[PDB]
């Protein structure tokens, strides 16, 4: 088969598509192009031919194989934010990615994943006793900020554990994400004219500088430590590899940065959407509270509990299915291949539109929010909210643990009301790199009223 998608009008086809991405935002552009042309189609971002694909088979093929274990984006943009061949998230150097990832993978599983369940709970508790920091005169909680703060505190105390300005760093993290999102697929042209990106350049510097203070402190503590054997966090593992020959300081410093931002960027917005769903679906809220009573009572949440929380698990999966945050995944072809029908040369970019695929493929009632969609054990080849394979989400296991931990410990204690008729559907969303609330609008607050 030849490849569907708009005409290559001898060099105008690329400019409209890229412009459309820049104009619409990556997510809505992908959805537009999949709705117009096929669920497997071609488009251009800068030069590079870039496939936008929603077919479950292609998704599976692509994520399954090692020769798609790269992403893509502006080299000038990635350099600007420090992800060019440095971290893991947008580190597209295969060998350098290959050696860095294992650090992330160790820290996000085994004993750290077990520690996480109580670290996550204790963090939320402490922030729920300080609700004055987040609540209005009219009782409106800034949930986004609350969640971002506990997610940061959580990440810090598990992976780095240096004291920090929670409030300031959360703002800086948002600044960094905005920049990352802004520059990821900007054309080279953009980067010449400098009163168009210094804005972003400074947001990056602010976060990078703030984190350099913390890693500096962390460096001192490691050098003057007695029991080096006993207390081995992520940041330390990295720093010790730098002290062997294995890693660059620059690379370490980005990995630490990338681990701290991860949860605040994605969990906060995911749980935000999950709370608006619980607010407007009392049928499900009871099922969850019932389950929590059966399973936990008023014992502290414990690792053994999380497997048992089956209803909440389905709620999480359906929330992510129905109203995602990470609705699309950027990959790159490292070797030539035939993919379903069509041929894909190496260097071809790929945007897997997993958000669309979860409304087209396996599910009984795809366009409404119901736990009926997860009544029958869903095969992992029809529902990848995290991705899988050699470059799937490194947080995928611990993320589910963390989301259960915070939902339990919040709902345990509080009923959650949304303002007005507001719901996930009526919230106005930006749909660019991720899918998140447009925070220049308002009515995004909630009300926490107790229980018993
Ligand atoms: C609701 C929460 C989350 C969702 C939905 C999510 C989703 C994803 C997805 C779809 C990817 C792309 C994987 C692929 O290309 O196949 C990804 C990558 C990644 N996620 Fe997450 N994630 C979440 C939370 C987290 C957390 C909490 C962490 C770390 C603490 C994390 C760390 C990462 C990293 C490091 C990668 C890059 C892996 C690589 O490129 O090698 N994620 N995530
Ligand atoms: C989950 C994630 C990482 C941790 C973080 O801090 C923020 C995000 C949101 C954007 C995700 C990204 C991982 C890679 C993703 C899936 C892509 O290939 C396109 C969008 C992007």
Swiss-Prot record:
Phosphorylated in vitro by PKA and PKG/PRKG1. These phosphorylations inhibit the catalytic activity as measured by estrone synthesis from androstenedione (36% decrease for PKA and 30% for PKG/PRKG1). It is an enzyme of class 1 (oxidoreductase). Widely expressed, including in adult and fetal brain, placenta, skin fibroblasts, adipose tissue and gonads. Pathway: Steroid hormone biosynthesis. InterPro entries: Cyt_P450 (IPR001128), Cyt_P450_CS (IPR017972), Cyt_P450_E_grp-I (IPR002401), Cyt_P450_sf (IPR036396), Cytochrome_P450_Monoox (IPR050196). It is a multi-pass membrane protein. GO terms for biological process: androgen catabolic process; estrogen biosynthetic process; female genitalia development; female gonad development; mammary gland development; negative regulation of chronic inflammatory response; negative regulation of macrophage chemotaxis; positive regulation of estradiol secretion. Its EC number is 1.14.14.14. Its cofactor is heme. One of its GO terms (cellular component) is endoplasmic reticulum membrane. GO terms for molecular function: aromatase activity; electron transfer activity; estrogen 2-hydroxylase activity; heme binding; iron ion binding; oxidoreductase activity, acting on paired donors, with incorporation or reduction of molecular oxygen, reduced flavin or flavoprotein as one donor, and incorporation of one atom of oxygen; oxygen binding; steroid hydroxylase activity. Substrate binds at residues 265, 330. Keywords: Disease variant, Endoplasmic reticulum, Heme, Iron, Lipid metabolism, Membrane, Metal-binding, Microsome, Monooxygenase, Oxidoreductase, Pseudohermaphroditism, Transmembrane, Transmembrane helix. It is found in: Endoplasmic reticulum membrane; Microsome membrane. It holds the Pfam family p450. Its main location: endoplasmic reticulum. Changing residue 220 to H: 2.5 fold decrease in affinity for androstenedione substrate; slightly affects PKA-mediated reduction in catalytic activity as measured by estrone synthesis from androstenedione in vitro (28% decrease compared with 36% for the wild-type protein) and PKG/PRKG1-mediated reduction in catalytic activity in vitro (15% decrease compared with 30% for the wild-type protein). Changing residue 391 to C: In AROD; 1.1% of wild-type activity. Gene3D superfamilies: Cytochrome P450. The chain crosses the membrane at residues 259-279. Belongs to the cytochrome P450 family. It is linked to Aromatase excess syndrome: An autosomal dominant disorder characterized by increased extraglandular aromatization of steroids that presents with heterosexual precocity in males and isosexual precocity in females. Aromatase deficiency: A rare disease in which fetal androgens are not converted into estrogens due to placental aromatase deficiency. Thus, pregnant women exhibit a hirsutism, which spontaneously resolves after post-partum. At birth, female babies present with pseudohermaphroditism due to virilization of extern genital organs. In adult females, manifestations include delay of puberty, breast hypoplasia and primary amenorrhoea with multicystic ovaries. A cytochrome P450 monooxygenase that catalyzes the conversion of C19 androgens, androst-4-ene-3,17-dione (androstenedione) and testosterone to the C18 estrogens, estrone and estradiol, respectively. Catalyzes three successive oxidations of C19 androgens: two conventional oxidations at C19 yielding 19-hydroxy and 19-oxo/19-aldehyde derivatives, followed by a third oxidative aromatization step that involves C1-beta hydrogen abstraction combined with cleavage of the C10-C19 bond to yield a phenolic A ring and formic acid. This is Aromatase.
């Amino acid at each position: 088969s030849s490849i569907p998608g708009p005409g290559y009008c001898m060099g105008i086809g690329p400019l409209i598509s890229h412009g459309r991405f820049l104009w619409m935002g990556i997510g809505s552009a992908c959805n537009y192009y999949n709705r117009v042309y096929g669920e497997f189609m071609r488009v251009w971002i800068s030069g590079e031919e870039t496939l936008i694909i929603s077919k479950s088979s292609s998704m599976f093929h692509i994520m399954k194989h090692n020769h798609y274990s790269s992403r893509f984006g502006s080299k000038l943009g990635l350099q600007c934010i420090g992800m060019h061949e440095k971290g893991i998230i947008f580190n597209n150097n295969p060998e350098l990615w290959k050696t860095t990832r294992p650090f992330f993978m160790k820290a996000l599983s085994g004993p750290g994943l077990v520690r996480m369940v109580t670290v996550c709970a204790e963090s939320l508790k402490t922030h729920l006793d300080r609700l004055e920091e987040v609540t209005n005169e009219s009782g409106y909680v800034d949930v986004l900020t609350l969640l971002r703060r506990v997610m940061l505190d959580t990440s810090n105390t598990l992976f780095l554990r240096i004291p920090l300005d929670e409030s300031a760093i959360v703002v800086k993290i948002q600044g960094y994400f905005d920049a990352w999102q802004a520059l990821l697929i900007k054309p080279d042209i953009f980067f010449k004219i400098s009163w168009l990106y210094k804005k972003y350049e400074k947001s990056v510097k602010d976060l990078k500088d703030a984190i350099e203070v913390l890693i500096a402190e962390k460096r001192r503590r490691i050098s003057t430590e007695e029991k080096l054997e006993e207390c081995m966090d992520f940041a330390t593992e990295l720093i010790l590899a730098e002290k062997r020959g294995d890693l660059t300081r620059e690379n370490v410093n980005q990995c630490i940065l990338e681990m701290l931002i991860a949860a605040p960027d994605t969990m906060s917005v995911s749980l935000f959407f999950m709370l608006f769903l619980i607010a407007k679906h009392p049928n499900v809220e009871e099922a969850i509270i019932k389950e929590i009573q059966t399973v936990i009572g008023e014992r502290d949440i414990k690792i053994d509990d999380i497997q048992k929380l089956k209803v909440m698990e389905n709620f999480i999966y359906e929330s992510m299915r129905y109203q995602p945050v990470v609705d699309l995944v950027m990959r790159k072809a490292l070797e030539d291949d035939v993919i379903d029908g069509y041929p894909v040369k190496k260097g071809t970019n790929i945007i897997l539109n997993i958000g669309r695929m979860h409304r087209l493929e396996f599910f009984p009632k795809p366009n409404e929010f119901t736990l009926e969609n997860f009544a029958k054990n869903v095969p992992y080849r029809y529902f990848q909210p995290f991705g899988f394979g050699p470059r799937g989400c490194a947080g995928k296991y611990i993320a589910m643990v963390m989301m259960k931990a915070i939902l339990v410990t919040l709902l345990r204690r509080f009923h959650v009301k949304t303002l007005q008729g507001q719901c996930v559907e009526s919230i106005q969303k930006i749909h660019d790199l991720s899918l998140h609330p447009d925070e220049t609008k308002n009515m995004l607050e909630m009300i926490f009223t107790p229980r018993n």
